[PDB]
Design a protein around this nucleic acid. Structure first.
Ligand code: N5P
Ligand code: N5P
Length: 848
DNA sequence: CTTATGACAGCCGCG
DNA sequence: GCGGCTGTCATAAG
């Protein structure tokens, strides 16, 4: 079969590559690769090579890679463009693999591992690695085996060997419930000391060296730990053998609160599964712990255990190991579902990049564009440095805070790529400039037509509509491929078909990101602004077009139909369209959902396309790619007192949705956005009730809402203390910690954290509050034994019995209810023009 | 990343 | 004792 790369690395004048050969064998080669870069030349010099601007270029072959780099520096000094691909690994891959790469994952060693490190003094810092590794579970995808490394004697105790037999049994039988599917795939290896285990693991590693190395938190915990441990114990010469090319680099990552270290294992591609998940799941999760994610994904989670993990090895080593196995298998189970690694393998081979560069839209697009330009002898521009400079972005209408009985929303598809394509925005496409009228003038087609020669954007930009721009071409090609591969979604292969289609979608949605990123070879401020400013007029123009149409239809005049617009959406108030027929004519809920759907399809969408073809002519664009789809139809169930929907402000609304782009729901479902019910900081029991409140407001009406309040409020004190405790994340605890006490500016949760410490001071048993970790918070009644307004303890857990009974006694229900339930509700009912209790004076609603 | 809201913390000005 | 305000910190959804 066809050859394919595995990992590629540049070291000095060499390029080191692991690859699969003609006969499926994994192997390594060192190549003294000669790069070509390109300079500009006079018309005199005749060449096949031109830059994107059609300017002639000379191909400079270099004897070695350092030459090429030294040349880029020399060229930088003179002040002349050094164009071509500066990242020689990409160039090497483009040269070596000059075809559509077809890979076979059965020949790619994917490893999932986790370690366990008994640490009795807090989280074992990986860069310090000061505690013995007492378990490694390492899964090899080729052998389909779980290789379990068990330390039997540590500083923290001696233990019996782990039992597969006991592991297989049910929890009720004293078992660990390690699944049947993996019980015959475990290879158990106990060790008498830690050096014996680490050197046996290190051999194992050379024998079965990961191409893709993954798992949950490997890049931040497991890899740094193993590395520093081996390193500290055996010296760096030994730890480096953990890379196939024996080169490793320590890298520091700065962030919000501080910096961090990762080990770059040259010749391996590390795809931490936590990072694959956060990147490609597209579901903002309240927690990213393997336990929570595995629960959300598989309805099962990580193995359960009594007491702290720090005592588990001593207390129940049997479980401790089994828990190490289950956690590695959890990741595998999630990947069996979401397919992220396969999706990474697809993208990486499609772009011809190092697989790990799937985390970089920059690196991916750059390599994709470079290749297609290479195929036509074109020379990519030098990556110039650019001052990071904020430009305007998405437009968001101020909603008038109200209730909205019938709402119908619409959506522009793939707005930003669409605009790039519609206008022809690209570096080499810039054709000039035009005198900008205020954006409002363009919105109302009142400004003078920008140009009738060039494709225009309301930010003053003008583009050639005669040339086919590099970027719009590349984004058009990815669109066309999507269709193609989602056309084989008519025909085992309904797998490679999905991942191709999903990955084209990922590239499409990631392009604008890159184009706004200053380290993009094709970044251009004038252009990025052109995209966002065009989008800003697209949306408001169509807000105008929609109002005009519906006013004309309804015989109304100057009636605000479009109630809200967020980035690529418009939400349309369909009250009057309903009134045209009249409510009593509809027989059931489904009958008016029928009516609206029909009206949008037959009357609005034609008026919308009609409206956008006008904009296209006004701006003089290359082609018309502005297409809207009807998203939601929302309202109260027929013959009910329910309000249907409400907006409390920008990105703050609830809708009672009946139909999402064609799909008609059985029961109605609440689309809630921005409101406290969608907030992780909101207590469990309260999240549940605000949602009930919103359910009752939209579907049932005021008297129902009021009934639930009076009831929930009567019944608050009996709810579990953990369910009514608000969550928060603790950051810079020390930064506000002045001798155990809240210094200037100390935020509410951190104050609570210190109050806990004050009651914790001098306790081992007590679970300490980790800096950068989620914390429960609870208000305390005035004059309490902890001497503060609040207390805050670690989340996901019950509070220590050393203070628990005094917390429960002193916690301020009144201040808790008002702060977490009532105030947010008053929020919603105020907007929806509703009362959550009777006899509320009408006069509150005024600024008297 | 940016667009945007909310919980709180001092600060200010007020007989 | 407190509303109007600028600021830090949290979280949301593209
Ligand atoms: O488009 N391609 O398919 C393509 C384009 C360029 C390619 C290759 C394969 C190599 N190169 C480039 C990269 C090198 O700098 C130069 C010569 O490549 P080579 O493999 O012929 O190396 P030589 O130095 O000639 O030695 P070799 O012939 O023994 O490998 O040409 C393939
Ligand atoms: O988005 N921009 O970056 C932007 C947008 C508009 C811009 C400029 C710079 C000028 N304009 C406006 C204001 C000018 O009156 C008009 C004409 O553009 P131009 O480039 O023709 O400017 P001139 O100085 O007239 O150039 P010329 O006399 O060489 O044609 O375009 C830049």
């Amino acid at each position: 079969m066809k050859e394919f790369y595995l990992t590629v690395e540049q070291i000095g004048d060499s390029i080191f590559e692991r690859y699969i050969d003609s006969n499926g064998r994994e192997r390594t080669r060192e190549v003294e690769y000669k790069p070509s870069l390109f300079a500009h030349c006079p018309e005199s010099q005749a060449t096949k090579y031109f830059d994107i601007y059609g300017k002639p270029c000379t191909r400079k072959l270099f004897a070695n890679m350092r030459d090429a780099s030294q040349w880029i520096k020399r060229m930088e000094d003179i002040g002349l463009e050094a164009l071509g691909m500066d990242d020689f690994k990409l160039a090497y891959l483009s040269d070596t693999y000059n075809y559509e790469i077809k890979y076979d994952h059965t020949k790619i060693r994917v490893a999932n591992f986790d370690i366990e490190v008994t640490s009795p003094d807090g989280f074992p810092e990986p860069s310090q690695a000061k505690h013995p590794i007492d378990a490694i579970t390492h899964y090899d995808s080729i052998d389909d085996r779980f290789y379990v490394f068990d330390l039997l004697n540590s500083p923290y105790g001696n233990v019996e060997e782990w039992s597969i037999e006991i592991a297989a049994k049910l929890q009720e039988q004293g078992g660990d419930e390690v699944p049947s599917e993996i019980i015959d795939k475990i290879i158990y290896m106990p060790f008498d000391n830690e050096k014996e285990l680490l050197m046996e693991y290190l051999n194992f590693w050379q024998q079965k060296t990961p191409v893709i190395l993954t798992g949950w938190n490997v890049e931040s915990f497991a890899i740094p730990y193993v590395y520093n441990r081996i390193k500290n114990i055996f010296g760096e010469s030994t730890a480096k053998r953990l890379s196939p090319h024996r080169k490793t680099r320590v890298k520091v990552i700065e962030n919000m609160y501080g910096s961090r270290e990762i080990i770059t294992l040259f010749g391996i591609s590390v795809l931490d599964y936590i990072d694959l998940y956060k990147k490609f799941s597209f579901t903002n999760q309240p927690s990213y712990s393997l336990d929570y994610i595995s629960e959300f994904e598989l309805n099962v989670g990580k193995l359960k255990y009594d007491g702290p993990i720090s005592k588990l090895r001593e207390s129940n080593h049997q479980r401790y190991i089994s828990y190490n196995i289950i956690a590695v298998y959890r990741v595998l189970q999630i990947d069996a579902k979401r397919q992220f690694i396969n999706l990474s393998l697809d993208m990486g081979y499609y772009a011809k990049i190092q697989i790990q560069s799937v985390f970089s839209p920059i690196k991916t697009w750059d390599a994709i564009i470079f290749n297609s330009l290479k195929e036509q002898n074109k020379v990519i521009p030098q990556g110039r440095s650019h001052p990071v400079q904020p430009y305007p972005g998405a437009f968001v209408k101020e909603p008038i805070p109200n209730r909205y009985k019938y709402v119908m929303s619409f959506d522009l598809t793939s707005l930003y790529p669409s605009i790039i394509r519609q206008v022809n925005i690209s570096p080499e496409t810039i054709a000039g400039t035009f005198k900008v009228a205020p954006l409002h003038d363009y919105i109302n087609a009142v400004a003078e037509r920008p140009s009738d020669v060039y494709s225009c954007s309301p930010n003053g930009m003008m583009y050639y509509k005669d040339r086919d721009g590099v970027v719009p071409t590349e984004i058009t090609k990815v669109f066309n491929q999507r269709k193609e591969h989602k056309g084989y979604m008519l025909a085992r292969t309904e797998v490679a078909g999905m991942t191709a289609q999903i990955n084209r979608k990922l590239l499409i949605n990631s392009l604008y990101g890159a184009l706004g990123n200053v380290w993009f070879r094709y970044y251009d401020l004038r252009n990025a602004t052109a995209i966002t400013t065009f989008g800003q007029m697209a949306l408001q123009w169509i807000e105008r077009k929609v109002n005009e149409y519906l006013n004309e239809v309804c015989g109304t005049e100057g009636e605000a139909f479009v109630l809200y617009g967020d980035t690529d959406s418009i939400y349309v108030s369909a009250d009057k369209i309903i009134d045209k027929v009249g409510e009593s004519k509809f027989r059931d809920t489904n009958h008016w959902v029928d009516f609206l759907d029909k009206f949008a399809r037959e009357r609005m969408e034609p008026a919308i396309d009609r409206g956008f073809r006008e904009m296209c002519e006004y701006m003089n664009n290359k082609q018309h790619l502005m297409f809207m789809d009807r998203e939601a139809i929302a309202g109260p169930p027929l013959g009910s007192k329910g309000i249907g929907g409400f907006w409390t402000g920008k990105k703050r609304y609830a809708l009672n949705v009946w139909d999402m782009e064609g799909t008609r729901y059985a029961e109605p479902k609440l689309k809630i956005m921005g409101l406290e019910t969608q907030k992780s900081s909101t207590p469990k029991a309260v999240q549940k009730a605000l949602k009930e409140c919103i359910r009752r407001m939209l579907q049932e009406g005021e008297e129902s809402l009021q009934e639930y309040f009076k009831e929930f409020e009567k019944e608050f004190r009996q709810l579990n203390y953990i369910s009514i405790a608000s969550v928060s994340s603790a950051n810079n605890i020390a930064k506000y910690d002045v001798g155990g006490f809240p210094g200037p500016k100390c935020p509410f949760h951190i104050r609570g954290i210190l109050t806990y410490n004050r009651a914790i001071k001098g306790n081992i048993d007590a679970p300490q509050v980790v800096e950068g970790e989620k914390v429960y918070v609870l208000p305390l009644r005035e004059g309490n034994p902890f001497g503060d307004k609040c207390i805050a303890w670690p989340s996901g857990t019950e509070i220590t019995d050393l203070i628990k009974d005094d917390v429960l006694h002193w916690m301020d229900y009144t201040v808790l209810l008002e702060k977490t339930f009532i105030k947010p509700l008053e929020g919603f009912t105020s907007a929806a023009k509703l009362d959550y209790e009777k006899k509320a004076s009408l006069f509150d609603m005024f600024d008297f």
